[PDB]
Amino acid sequence: GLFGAIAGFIENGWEGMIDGWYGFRHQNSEGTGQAADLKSTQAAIDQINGKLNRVIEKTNEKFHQIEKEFSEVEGRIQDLEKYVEDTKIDLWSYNAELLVALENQHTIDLTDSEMNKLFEKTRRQLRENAEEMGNGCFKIYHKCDNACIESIRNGTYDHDVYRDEALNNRFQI
Amino acid sequence: GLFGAIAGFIENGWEGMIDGWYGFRHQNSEGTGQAADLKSTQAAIDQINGKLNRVIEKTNEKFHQIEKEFSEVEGRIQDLEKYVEDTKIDLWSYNAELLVALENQHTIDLTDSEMNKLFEKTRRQLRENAEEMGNGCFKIYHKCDNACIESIRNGTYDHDVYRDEALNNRFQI
Amino acid sequence: GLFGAIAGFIENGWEGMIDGWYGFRHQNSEGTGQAADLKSTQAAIDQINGKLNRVIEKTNEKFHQIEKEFSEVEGRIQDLEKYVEDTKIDLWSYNAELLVALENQHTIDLTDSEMNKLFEKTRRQLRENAEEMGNGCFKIYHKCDNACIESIRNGTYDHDVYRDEALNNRFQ
Amino acid sequence: STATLCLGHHAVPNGTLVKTITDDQIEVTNATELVQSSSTGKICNNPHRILDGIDCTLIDALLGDPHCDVFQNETWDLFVERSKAFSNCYPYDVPDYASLRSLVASSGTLEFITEGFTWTGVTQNGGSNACKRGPGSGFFSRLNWLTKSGSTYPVLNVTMPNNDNFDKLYIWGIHHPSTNQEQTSLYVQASGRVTVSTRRSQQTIIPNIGSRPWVRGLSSRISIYWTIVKPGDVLVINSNGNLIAPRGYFKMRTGKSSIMRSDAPIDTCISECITPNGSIPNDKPFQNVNKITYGACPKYVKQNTLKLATGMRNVPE
Amino acid sequence: STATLCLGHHAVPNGTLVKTITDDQIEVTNATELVQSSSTGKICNNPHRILDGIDCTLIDALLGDPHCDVFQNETWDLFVERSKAFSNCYPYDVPDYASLRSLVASSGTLEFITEGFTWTGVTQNGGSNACKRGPGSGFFSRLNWLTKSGSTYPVLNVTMPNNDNFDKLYIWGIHHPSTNQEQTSLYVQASGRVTVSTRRSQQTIIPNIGSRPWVRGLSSRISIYWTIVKPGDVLVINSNGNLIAPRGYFKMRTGKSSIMRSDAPIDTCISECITPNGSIPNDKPFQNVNKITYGACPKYVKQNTLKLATGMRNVPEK
Amino acid sequence: NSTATLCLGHHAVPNGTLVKTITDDQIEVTNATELVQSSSTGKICNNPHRILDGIDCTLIDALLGDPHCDVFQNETWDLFVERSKAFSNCYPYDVPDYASLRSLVASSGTLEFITEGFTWTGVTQNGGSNACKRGPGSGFFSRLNWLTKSGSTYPVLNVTMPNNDNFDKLYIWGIHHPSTNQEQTSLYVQASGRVTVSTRRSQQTIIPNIGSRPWVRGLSSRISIYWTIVKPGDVLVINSNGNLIAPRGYFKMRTGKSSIMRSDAPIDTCISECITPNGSIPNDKPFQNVNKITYGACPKYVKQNTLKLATGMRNVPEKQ
Numbered sequence A, B: 001g002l003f004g005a006i007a008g009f010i011e012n013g014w015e016g017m018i019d020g021w022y023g024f025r026h027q028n029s030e031g032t033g034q035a036a037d038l039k040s041t042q043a044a045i046d047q048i049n050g051k052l053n054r055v056i057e058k059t060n061e062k063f064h065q066i067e068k069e070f071s072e073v074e075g076r077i078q079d080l081e082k083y084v085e086d087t088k089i090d091l092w093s094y095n096a097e098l099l100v101a102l103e104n105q106h107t108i109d110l111t112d113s114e115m116n117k118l119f120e121k122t123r124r125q126l127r128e129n130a131e132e133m134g135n136g137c138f139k140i141y142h143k144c145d146n147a148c149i150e151s152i153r154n155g156t157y158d159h160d161v162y163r164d165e166a167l168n169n170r171f172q173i
Numbered sequence C: 001g002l003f004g005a006i007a008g009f010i011e012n013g014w015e016g017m018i019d020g021w022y023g024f025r026h027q028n029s030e031g032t033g034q035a036a037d038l039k040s041t042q043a044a045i046d047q048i049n050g051k052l053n054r055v056i057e058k059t060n061e062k063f064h065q066i067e068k069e070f071s072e073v074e075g076r077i078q079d080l081e082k083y084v085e086d087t088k089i090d091l092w093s094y095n096a097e098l099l100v101a102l103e104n105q106h107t108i109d110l111t112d113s114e115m116n117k118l119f120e121k122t123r124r125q126l127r128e129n130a131e132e133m134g135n136g137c138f139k140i141y142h143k144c145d146n147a148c149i150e151s152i153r154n155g156t157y158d159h160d161v162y163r164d165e166a167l168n169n170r171f172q
Numbered sequence D: 001s002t003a004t005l006c007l008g009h010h011a012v013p014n015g016t017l018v019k020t021i022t023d024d025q026i027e028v029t030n031a032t033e034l035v036q037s038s039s040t041g042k043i044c045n046n047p048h049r050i051l052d053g054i055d056c057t058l059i060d061a062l063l064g065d066p067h068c069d070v071f072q073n074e075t076w077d078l079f080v081e082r083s084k085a086f087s088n089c090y091p092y093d094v095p096d097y098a099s100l101r102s103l104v105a106s107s108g109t110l111e112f113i114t115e116g117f118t119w120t121g122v123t124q125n126g127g128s129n130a131c132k133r134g135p136g137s138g139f140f141s142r143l144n145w146l147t148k149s150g151s152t153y154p155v156l157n158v159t160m161p162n163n164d165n166f167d168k169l170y171i172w173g174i175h176h177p178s179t180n181q182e183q184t185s186l187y188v189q190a191s192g193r194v195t196v197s198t199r200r201s202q203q204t205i206i207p208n209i210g211s212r213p214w215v216r217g218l219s220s221r222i223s224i225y226w227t228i229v230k231p232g233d234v235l236v237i238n239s240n241g242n243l244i245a246p247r248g249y250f251k252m253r254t255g256k257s258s259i260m261r262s263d264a265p266i267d268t269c270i271s272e273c274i275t276p277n278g279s280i281p282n283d284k285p286f287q288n289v290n291k292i293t294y295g296a297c298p299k300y301v302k303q304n305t306l307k308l309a310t311g312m313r314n315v316p317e
Numbered sequence E: 001s002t003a004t005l006c007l008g009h010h011a012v013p014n015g016t017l018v019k020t021i022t023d024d025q026i027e028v029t030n031a032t033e034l035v036q037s038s039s040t041g042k043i044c045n046n047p048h049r050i051l052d053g054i055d056c057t058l059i060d061a062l063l064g065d066p067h068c069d070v071f072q073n074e075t076w077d078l079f080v081e082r083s084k085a086f087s088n089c090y091p092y093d094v095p096d097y098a099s100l101r102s103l104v105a106s107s108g109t110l111e112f113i114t115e116g117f118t119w120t121g122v123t124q125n126g127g128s129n130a131c132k133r134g135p136g137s138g139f140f141s142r143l144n145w146l147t148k149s150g151s152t153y154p155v156l157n158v159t160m161p162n163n164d165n166f167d168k169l170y171i172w173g174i175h176h177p178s179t180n181q182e183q184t185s186l187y188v189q190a191s192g193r194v195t196v197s198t199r200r201s202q203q204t205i206i207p208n209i210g211s212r213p214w215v216r217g218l219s220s221r222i223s224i225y226w227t228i229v230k231p232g233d234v235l236v237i238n239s240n241g242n243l244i245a246p247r248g249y250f251k252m253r254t255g256k257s258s259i260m261r262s263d264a265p266i267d268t269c270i271s272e273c274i275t276p277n278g279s280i281p282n283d284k285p286f287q288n289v290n291k292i293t294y295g296a297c298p299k300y301v302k303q304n305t306l307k308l309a310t311g312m313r314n315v316p317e318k
Numbered sequence F: 001n002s003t004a005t006l007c008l009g010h011h012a013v014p015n016g017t018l019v020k021t022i023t024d025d026q027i028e029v030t031n032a033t034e035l036v037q038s039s040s041t042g043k044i045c046n047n048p049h050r051i052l053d054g055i056d057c058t059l060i061d062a063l064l065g066d067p068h069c070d071v072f073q074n075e076t077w078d079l080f081v082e083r084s085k086a087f088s089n090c091y092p093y094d095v096p097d098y099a100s101l102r103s104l105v106a107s108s109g110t111l112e113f114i115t116e117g118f119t120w121t122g123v124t125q126n127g128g129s130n131a132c133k134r135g136p137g138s139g140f141f142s143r144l145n146w147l148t149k150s151g152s153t154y155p156v157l158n159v160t161m162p163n164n165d166n167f168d169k170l171y172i173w174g175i176h177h178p179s180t181n182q183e184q185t186s187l188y189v190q191a192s193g194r195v196t197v198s199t200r201r202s203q204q205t206i207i208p209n210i211g212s213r214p215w216v217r218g219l220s221s222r223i224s225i226y227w228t229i230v231k232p233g234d235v236l237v238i239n240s241n242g243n244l245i246a247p248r249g250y251f252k253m254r255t256g257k258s259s260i261m262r263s264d265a266p267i268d269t270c271i272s273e274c275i276t277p278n279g280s281i282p283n284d285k286p287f288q289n290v291n292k293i294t295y296g297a298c299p300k301y302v303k304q305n306t307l308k309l310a311t312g313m314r315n316v317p318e319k320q
């Protein structure tokens, strides 16, 4: 993908995450846990649904047309009737082939994009209290209990509360 | 958008910015101010113009064609004449519909992209003298007067001048 | 490009890089050097080949069709024959024109993307041991010999080894 | 002490392969099919009015082949012609059969108004054992076979103005006898002719004596022709032999009507889109069932499957 | 001691909704219309040469219906047929009328060269009160109605070679009398015939006696046919009755000429694209005015509006 | 120092290629490839398709059996090539709807002809003309049988021929248009001829037309050609009291990939799937600008003479 997250710096996906498309796994002093991020999941789903709604259930109504099967050979007019229809089908077949190719390439890039957006959104919250391990995981440099982890996940994490503690752990051996 | 800037980590646009597409707002010791960034504005405008010029004013010259309205019922030939034209119109109508959809999706992503490019360009200038608040704003960790702000905006900011001061304010208590 | 790397924060390309599409240049205590990154080069090439294989060598087989040149004027049927074919050609000509435009715009963005991916991949390895000068170059804040540079290039650089030294030089 | 927070995305054990710009086949978490490739095998009788031709072609229903009498004044959105339809009246041909079929199919009605043509000096209602109605001989219900009266067959000159505010379709014909003996005993004159005209058009047909293949006992034939008469215009039929006269006109309408060849059974259900293979749903944008369609139908394409990605790239553990 | 620098983008109070891949309607700062949907109602007389048919169809101008005489030798880029047009000569039909109309329309000229056909043993210049020119009876200006001379109508056998370096279009016809009495008093023979041939093609038409509806006093009719004669080839007209002879040929050209049915008035202005509704500008790639077009025109589409985004996503300040 | 610098970058070339994109009319990339085939060798390759060179003969003259086209009897083709130097040299004729007969024979791909034993009672067979010389003497189309009176009588012919085979039969026949009444009566006795050819479901009736046409090979008279397809189970009936140009049998009808092409390109020993009147072209590219007329596995014809597909990144050289 264009953003290098899915099938990129995130090595692989999670079969165990059945309640969402994107999410968090953590390890803290209280143990380990998993939770889906609903906002990013919904962003991807909404876009795909919109895309899907533009493609599906839009059909034109045609009634009397030309004939397309013939029981006798007739020559010039029948040649033209057959050629018109064959020309039409090929052009529509091309349209269909290109449509799916463009759409699918885009769907992959868009989902890749949302993964990356969630990563950057989280990075930004954490400010100087965390570093990036390069595999989609942050090392948070302070004691961060289940409440603290949930505060990151629901976007209310206050970096100032933990900054002194984090800066101390980061820049000291 | 794919880059998550416009309608993303930047909450909204500025109706008050009438002299450019992208720009800066600041608060320093001397007060507050607003200024457009002309380089990024021009990047977006140029791309949209180029796109627009490819689509508009490229036209086929056709003279004698087939007839498309009929005063009598004739059957087979007229069926074919009507079907040919109706087939043509539907294929062109599809082309037009897809063109606008692709173009517009791209225009949104490209403008989103330029916003992000300006952000990253600014981030890079500031080096270790600023942190990123996550809403499109940088906290600059040193006294930065109107000249200093303008130096960031016109791409001549020298981070080394302020580094000692900034590093001191960033990492304390 | 959409990612702002190629023809963006990287000022220009390297004519002197003849062994790859993307790569590294360095200066350390042991001297200077250039090396291509094969993984990113191959990523771009693979995608372009795939794109190319979808476009090329997919051809319709058509045998008996309608006539398309005429020696006499006949009127209504010939008008229709000519119009059918002219309509077909214009629609195909449009398809061809749009195809190339979309493909080429995408190829530029995809190659731009890979440049950016390699940059971010490198940034991530270096952690707090390097800063970004803003022109595609990192300043590495520790002695980093030829082995150390190669460790960055082949993705095995251990930031912990150099962290104390780097943090000392950066902040002071 | 510290903590670790990893961001990630889901994956499934059983992904779907899809096509993209750069990839012939690449695995995503889920996809949806855009080409409708199956049918129930049955034509749904709603919402469109479907008229089953059963043993009758539209043309035989038009002309009034005795076994197609049930179709008098019928109407349809889609007339379905069955492959086991058969003709069972006088052997006939229609020059430009396809057009007459098309234009009647498109009109969508066999509504027929009888008009009082006066045929002076000729015998009406001629019939044949090739076209039995009941036990006795008969003929097409909408055509009037004229023959001599006594020793004479005069020059017929009959007219019928369209004073209505709609178009009238007149179906008529000419009789081709198999021998000269037959020609003279029916029409007196050795050589017949039929000239049917309106103010802006005309048709003149000369019959041709001679043998054709035996059909239902007969080497002779009838040839069918038609004439549309606009409001204000007037029909003139002129003949000194061999005329198969019209009994009136068919009303011409415009609308959504058509015709289809299919042997699919008709069934009680709702489906906007009809194909010769049966009705198909139109939830998908494309279909691979049949290029012949009626109604709100997906576009026919050559591909049998096109998968649209409805999820991210699938990168399993 | 510190400062804040926020990056941002503009917004407008009055955005425009557009369509995208993922969105049916989404607001951007500005858009531009790609479908031309209006016309002035008038056909501009430049840059194309527009010939107004007024009371005449092209075919009546060709044949030479007296009230269409003003069109002799005329030329056009676009011939405009008006709905008020009418015929006022001998009642006629043209089998495959559409094709003759098309091929003359496309040629773009009614330039006519008179040739000296010698018709031996027949009376020329027959006329009718169905086709008055002046107070007296008349006929199509480009056709010569032949009838018996005295008690006889012989087998006409005339030739006319194309020695020029261009194609000749010959318009001719056959007369269908209403009665046998009429057939014999005009042409002597009870059954006429017309055979017009070139080296590679032929047409033979037999007339049909009988009554048609009354048009301008007449139950009889004329049927029109045509023959193209290539350079080096030669026309042969052969008939023993009912021939409506040609007086010469029409020159055939190829170019950008055509025909259009419209009641739009013609006006002094410049416009490359013409529709039956009037001229339209061609600055936009698509149009919704009419599928019938002439000139450098936008492609006709079913949509009435298609907006192309010319600005970013609009996220108003709130 | 003691520090190090590591710069990331990408390549560039001195000689880039300009390409078109969505936002750009011309923009330089490192490399591109051409998608429009615009050249030909000028020669039609004789593989893999079976090419039959018409030489001096149109397909219709090969069908009818113009003496100088006798070499084409029972021939078959994937593509029949008609040359501009072709000429007719038999009885002067026309084919109403010539295009269709040409098309349907072209598409069938065979002139395989089976002679049938039609019995023509009371008429003279094998009529010929000096307009159609075979050897030194007069002759006629090899697949047509010109019937004329026998001894001052020309009776009403009523001949039949059922299709009992499991394939379609194509019958070519015609009618003779004499130039004078004298000619009509001395050939056919009756002052007015007629031909009615019919199957169970269809019929054609043609009346001949007396009169002079331009001189072609000594003759003001003409023949007009017609055809009739007879399905399995059906039956042909020919009925005439004068002017019939009778068939000698039927042509077998096939379906497949056969067609016809007008070209003066020479044929050559090579392999090429795609044929145009300008000669064979390769089909490695998706589009072509050589000719809208094509046969085989061919690129789609487009109006553009060049379309470049980018196969590399944006080209941004450093030097000046």
Ligand SMILES: CC(=O)N[C@H]1[C@H](O[C@H]2[C@@H](O)[C@@H](CO)O[C@@H](O[C@H]3[C@H](O)[C@@H](O)[C@H](O)O[C@@H]3CO)[C@@H]2O)O[C@H](CO)[C@@H](O[C@@H]2O[C@H](CO[C@]3(C(=O)O)C[C@H](O)[C@@H](NC(C)=O)[C@H]([C@H](O)[C@H](O)CO)O3)[C@H](O)[C@H](O)[C@H]2O)[C@@H]1O
Residues within 6 Å of the ligand: D126, D127, D128, D129, D130, D137, D145, D147, D150, D151, D176, D177, D178, D182, D185, D186, D217, D218, D219, D220, D221
């Ligand atoms: C009408 C009829 O019954 N025709 C019989 C026919 O009968 C006539 C015949 O005996 C002649 C002899 O010269 O005499 C006629 O009487 C005349 C009378 O002398 C005269 O004074 C008076 O003024 O006029 C009458 C004639 O109007 C007899 O009427 O005998 C022949 C020979 O056997 C029969 O031929 C066979 O015809 C078969 C098909 O029969 C039908 C049919 O299609 O079913 C019968 C229909 O009644 C008849 N319909 C009409 C409207 O005429 C049709 C029709 O003629 C044909 O379809 C036209 O093509 O024929 C079958 O062809 C068989 O092979 C023949 O032998 C004939 O039916």
Ligand SMILES: CC(=O)N[C@H]1[C@H](O[C@H]2[C@@H](O)[C@@H](CO)O[C@@H](O[C@H]3[C@H](O)[C@@H](O)[C@H](O)O[C@@H]3CO)[C@@H]2O)O[C@H](CO)[C@@H](O[C@@H]2O[C@H](CO[C@]3(C(=O)O)C[C@H](O)[C@@H](NC(C)=O)[C@H]([C@H](O)[C@H](O)CO)O3)[C@H](O)[C@H](O)[C@H]2O)[C@@H]1O
Residues within 6 Å of the ligand: E126, E127, E128, E129, E130, E137, E145, E147, E150, E151, E177, E178, E182, E185, E186, E217, E218, E220, E221
């Ligand atoms: C041709 C003509 O004027 N016909 C009159 C016709 O008078 C002719 C008739 O008496 C014959 C007798 O055999 O003699 C002709 O004169 C010949 C003369 O006797 C002879 O000595 C000499 O050698 O030759 C001449 C000419 O050959 C008479 O001319 O009388 C009938 C019956 O009363 C008239 O019928 C009416 O016709 C009306 C329409 O008239 C026109 C028309 O279209 O306006 C007049 C035109 O002059 C005439 N044009 C030509 C080229 O003939 C046409 C034309 O005949 C028709 O259009 C063909 O369809 O007719 C109207 O139809 C009315 O209802 C009739 O009663 C007839 O005019």
Ligand SMILES: *[C@@H]1O[C@H](CO)[C@@H](O)[C@H](O[C@@H]2O[C@H](CO)[C@@H](O[C@@H]3O[C@H](CO)[C@@H](O)[C@H](O)[C@@H]3O)[C@H](O)[C@H]2NC(C)=O)[C@H]1NC(C)=O
Residues within 6 Å of the ligand: E157, E158, E159, E160, E234, E236, F212, F213, F214, F215, F220
């Ligand atoms: C009817 O009139 C037409 C046209 O005016 C004539 O075609 C036709 O006969 C003409 O016949 C003569 C011979 O009878 C042909 O002349 C030949 O020309 C040759 C030179 O190229 C010469 O070598 C021959 O020996 C002939 O003399 C003449 O071409 C032919 N004209 C045309 C145009 O075909 C007339 N026929 C009747 C029955 O009246």
Ligand SMILES: *[C@@H]1O[C@H](CO)[C@@H](O[C@@H]2O[C@H](CO)[C@@H](O[C@@H]3O[C@H](CO)[C@@H](O)[C@H](O)[C@@H]3O)[C@H](O)[C@H]2NC(C)=O)[C@H](O)[C@H]1NC(C)=O
Residues within 6 Å of the ligand: D178, D179, D211, D212, D213, D214, D219, F158, F159, F160, F235
């Ligand atoms: C002209 O010739 C044709 C064919 O040679 C003659 O047609 C044939 O006529 C006979 C007797 O009328 C038909 O025989 C019948 O066959 C049916 C069906 O099997 C059977 O039920 C009858 O009892 C009878 O045997 C035969 O089918 C028919 N053949 C064809 C091909 O039409 C025709 O009669 C001749 N006409 C004249 C006027 O000479």
Ligand SMILES: *[C@@H]1O[C@H](CO)[C@@H](O[C@@H]2O[C@H](CO)[C@@H](O[C@@H]3O[C@H](CO)[C@@H](O)[C@H](O)[C@@H]3O)[C@H](O)[C@H]2NC(C)=O)[C@H](O)[C@H]1NC(C)=O
Residues within 6 Å of the ligand: D157, D158, D159, D234, E179, E211, E212, E213, E214, E219
């Ligand atoms: C053939 O039969 C038809 C059917 O009636 C006849 O057509 C009619 O012919 C008469 C002339 O006798 C026309 O009468 C004229 O009507 C106009 C009214 O507009 C009037 O002004 C005249 O004084 C005259 O009376 C009538 O219009 C005409 N109708 C049609 C539809 O053609 C025809 O006359 C018959 N011919 C023969 C030879 O029997």
Ligand SMILES: *[C@@H]1O[C@H](CO[C@H]2O[C@@H](C)[C@@H](O)[C@@H](O)[C@@H]2O)[C@@H](O[C@@H]2O[C@H](CO)[C@@H](O)[C@H](O)[C@H]2NC(C)=O)[C@H](O)[C@H]1NC(C)=O
Residues within 6 Å of the ligand: D072, D073, D111, D112, D113, D114
């Ligand atoms: C077929 O219909 C015609 C026409 O009658 C129409 O009347 C409409 C109100 C409507 O019912 C429509 O379906 C129908 O088609 C009948 O022929 C004649 O119609 C005229 C004028 O419409 C009447 O004045 C006559 O009464 C009528 N003829 C009769 C009753 O003999 C016609 O009867 C009908 N045929 C059949 C077999 O039903």
Ligand SMILES: *[C@@H]1O[C@H](CO)[C@@H](O[C@@H]2O[C@H](CO)[C@@H](O)[C@H](O)[C@H]2NC(C)=O)[C@H](O)[C@H]1NC(C)=O
Residues within 6 Å of the ligand: A147, A148, A150, A151, A154, A156
């Ligand atoms: C984000 O998550 C935190 C931690 O779970 C939430 O804070 C708790 O809220 C509940 C109910 O309001 C209280 O009873 C707890 O005592 C809170 N714990 C704290 C503040 O440490 C917080 O409400 C969440 N916010 C949102 C917007 O979802």
Ligand SMILES: *[C@@H]1O[C@H](CO)[C@@H](O[C@@H]2O[C@H](CO)[C@@H](O)[C@H](O)[C@H]2NC(C)=O)[C@H](O)[C@H]1NC(C)=O
Residues within 6 Å of the ligand: A069, D037, D038, D039, D276, D277, D288, D289, D290
């Ligand atoms: C729908 O019906 C048509 C009947 O014509 C089917 O098309 C035929 O398919 C068979 C293969 O089973 C071929 O042998 C025939 O040559 C085809 N005929 C034509 C005219 O295309 C079609 O397969 C049916 N499709 C479905 C989904 O039922």
Ligand SMILES: *[C@@H]1O[C@H](CO)[C@@H](O[C@@H]2O[C@H](CO)[C@@H](O)[C@H](O)[C@H]2NC(C)=O)[C@H](O)[C@H]1NC(C)=O
Residues within 6 Å of the ligand: E037, E038, E039, E276, E277, E288, E289, E290
């Ligand atoms: C241009 O002219 C055509 C005339 O055909 C107009 O189309 C007709 O419009 C009327 C009134 O809306 C409809 O009742 C007809 O059904 C239309 N006919 C056809 C054939 O489409 C068309 O609306 C005109 N457009 C403009 C912009 O003037």
Ligand SMILES: *[C@@H]1O[C@H](CO)[C@@H](O[C@@H]2O[C@H](CO)[C@@H](O)[C@H](O)[C@H]2NC(C)=O)[C@H](O)[C@H]1NC(C)=O
Residues within 6 Å of the ligand: F073, F074, F112, F113, F114, F115
């Ligand atoms: C024309 O080709 C065919 C073979 O397809 C020959 O026609 C007859 O073929 C049948 C077998 O189908 C044989 O019984 C006959 O011997 C053939 N007819 C005659 C009159 O001999 C025919 O021989 C071929 N002619 C040429 C010149 O090749």
Ligand SMILES: *[C@@H]1O[C@H](CO)[C@@H](O[C@@H]2O[C@H](CO)[C@@H](O)[C@H](O)[C@H]2NC(C)=O)[C@H](O)[C@H]1NC(C)=O
Residues within 6 Å of the ligand: C069, F038, F039, F040, F277, F278, F289, F290, F291
């Ligand atoms: C392909 O062969 C065709 C033969 O017709 C060429 O088409 C003609 O080209 C000439 C010279 O440019 C033009 O004057 C004609 O207008 C063309 N004729 C038609 C019918 O289009 C064509 O140029 C050849 N191209 C190549 C590459 O060989």
Ligand SMILES: *[C@@H]1O[C@H](CO)[C@@H](O)[C@H](O)[C@H]1NC(C)=O
Residues within 6 Å of the ligand: B146, B147, B148, B150, B151, B154, B156
């Ligand atoms: C940038 O702004 C600074 C401060 O006002 C000014 O001194 C300098 O000239 C500007 N540089 C450029 C290149 O415009």
Ligand SMILES: *[C@@H]1O[C@H](CO)[C@@H](O)[C@H](O)[C@H]1NC(C)=O
Residues within 6 Å of the ligand: C147, C148, C150, C151, C154, C156
């Ligand atoms: C990477 O480079 C280092 C330094 O040269 C080398 O020792 C190490 O083995 C390399 N690792 C891989 C996986 O190639």
Ligand SMILES: *[C@@H]1O[C@H](CO)[C@@H](O)[C@H](O)[C@H]1NC(C)=O
Residues within 6 Å of the ligand: A052, D030, D031, D032, D310
């Ligand atoms: C795949 O996508 C469709 C359409 O959005 C959806 O209805 C369905 O839930 C998905 N299928 C599975 C197995 O998850």
Ligand SMILES: *[C@@H]1O[C@H](CO)[C@@H](O)[C@H](O)[C@H]1NC(C)=O
Residues within 6 Å of the ligand: E072, E073, E111, E112, E113
């Ligand atoms: C029409 O044009 C030709 C030459 O251009 C001329 O000879 C002829 O007399 C002209 N006729 C009229 C009526 O102007």
Ligand SMILES: *[C@@H]1O[C@H](CO)[C@@H](O)[C@H](O)[C@H]1NC(C)=O
Residues within 6 Å of the ligand: C052, F031, F032, F033, F311
């Ligand atoms: C240009 O592109 C084609 C297709 O990928 C390739 O075969 C060729 O090597 C490329 N040219 C260069 C100089 O790399």
